[PDB]
Write a protein that binds this ligand. Structure first.
Ligand SMILES: Cc1cc2nc3c(=O)[nH]c(=O)nc-3n(C[C@H](O)[C@H](O)[C@H](O)COP(=O)(O)O)c2cc1C
Ligand SMILES: [Cl-]
Length: 131
């Protein structure tokens, strides 16, 4: 459950932008989305639950950034990327995206956490250069 994790409760209380996915459901869809995520992206909660978060990507999103995310998920490593994302209205923003495994007491991945932060184009260019 989403509220099993004190990090999730903290981010909820702090009114941050995040989602929780469930990799045991086909296509690793979102099972919880914060209000901040909804406001950032322009989607209603009923439009995001049950969907993989790739709906935020579009033609100007760098496929190499998406590949870094993919590899983090396949290798079990926490990961930070900066990539271009799209709101429901088609407007774009740079997203500094953090994805981490949420584990049980035996080490199994039960859920993934993704935390989104809108950053400026200038911040994004500097981040990508430094990577
Ligand atoms: C918890 C979580 C949150 C994610 N949040 C975003 C996001 O904010 N923006 C984005 O472009 N991709 C995000 N993704 C990445 C996509 O959901 C997806 O993992 C990536 O596009 C590769 O999927 P594929 O291997 O099916 O191509 C997130 C993934 C997870 C697991
Ligand atoms: Cl995925």
């Amino acid at each position: 459950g989403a509220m099993d994790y004190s990090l999730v409760k903290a981010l909820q209380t702090a009114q941050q932008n995040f989602v929780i996915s469930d990799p045991s459901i086909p296509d690793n869809p979102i099972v919880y989305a914060s209000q901040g995520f909804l406001t950032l992206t322009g989607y209603a909660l009923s439009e995001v639950l049950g969907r993989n978060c790739r709906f935020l990507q579009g033609p100007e999103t760098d496929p190499k950034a998406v590949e870094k995310v993919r590899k983090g998920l396949e290798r079990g490593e926490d990961t930070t990327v900066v990539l271009l994302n799209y709101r429901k209205d088609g407007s774009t923003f740079w997203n500094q995206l953090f994805i981490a495994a949420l584990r049980d007491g035996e080490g199994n991945v039960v859920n993934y956490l993704g935390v989104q932060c809108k950053v400026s184009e200038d911040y994004a260019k500097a981040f990508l250069k430094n990577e």
